Design a protein around this ligand. Structure first.
Ligand SMILES: Nc1nc2c(ncn2[C@@H]2O[C@H](COP(=O)(O)OP(=O)(O)O)[C@@H](O)[C@H]2O)c(=O)[nH]1
Ligand SMILES: [Mg+2]
Ligand SMILES: [Mg+2]
Length: 166
């Protein structure tokens, strides 16, 4: 059969969860996507010559939250490079996912979004060290320019693929 990967995009409000997801799906940049919108997609894609079903959930910032954390197989942990609080929040999101999953090994990718912006308050060295501390990849993205957007989602799929063989 066809392989299925449930991906969940998490992160503080305004970091670009929706802009990243809409860029992936629509190849369009959204300026004003309502912050209450939770949008989920079932889409067939080809990654590394293997076709799979991606179930992608763009979260909006309690019983339902634990529900989509239980169901999610890999998590895009998004922060914005001009928002130090969103970067500091990553460890809280990570801990909460592991708590809900009741598992210490959850596939994740660290995403630093809005890299097109001049205002940078998160040092890339600290983003690299945070990803290193977690043992996960770190990808710099711009949903405005589409830089790294496909890489971020496809990398998470590859991480789930490796997790399933362990
Ligand atoms: N310059 C720039 N703005 C972005 C980027 N990603 C998102 N935004 C803007 O940040 C605001 C919040 O983005 P949104 O995707 O709605 O954030 P969400 O709350 O995490 O879903 C919107 O005005 C977006 O246009 C980016 O990569 N670059
Ligand atoms: Mg949103
Ligand atoms: Mg618009």
């Amino acid at each position: 059969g066809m392989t299925e990967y449930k991906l969940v995009v998490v992160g503080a409000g305004g970091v670009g969860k929706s802009a990243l997801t809409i860029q992936l799906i629509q190849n369009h940049f959204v300026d004003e996507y309502d912050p209450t919108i939770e949008d989920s997609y079932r889409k067939q894609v080809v990654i590394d010559g293997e076709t799979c079903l991606l179930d992608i959930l763009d979260t909006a910032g309690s019983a339902m939250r634990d529900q989509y954390m239980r169901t999610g197989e890999g998590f895009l942990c998004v922060f914005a490079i001009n928002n130090s609080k969103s970067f500091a929040d990553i460890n809280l999101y990570r801990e909460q996912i592991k708590r809900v999953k009741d598992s210490d090994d959850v596939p994740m990718v660290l995403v630093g979004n809005k890299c097109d912006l001049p205002t940078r308050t998160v040092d890339t060295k600290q983003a690299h060290e945070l990803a290193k501390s977690y043992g996960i990849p770190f990808i710099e993205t711009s949903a405005k320019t589409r830089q790294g957007v496909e890489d971020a989602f496809y990398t998470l799929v590859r991480e789930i693929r490796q997790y399933r063989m362990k």
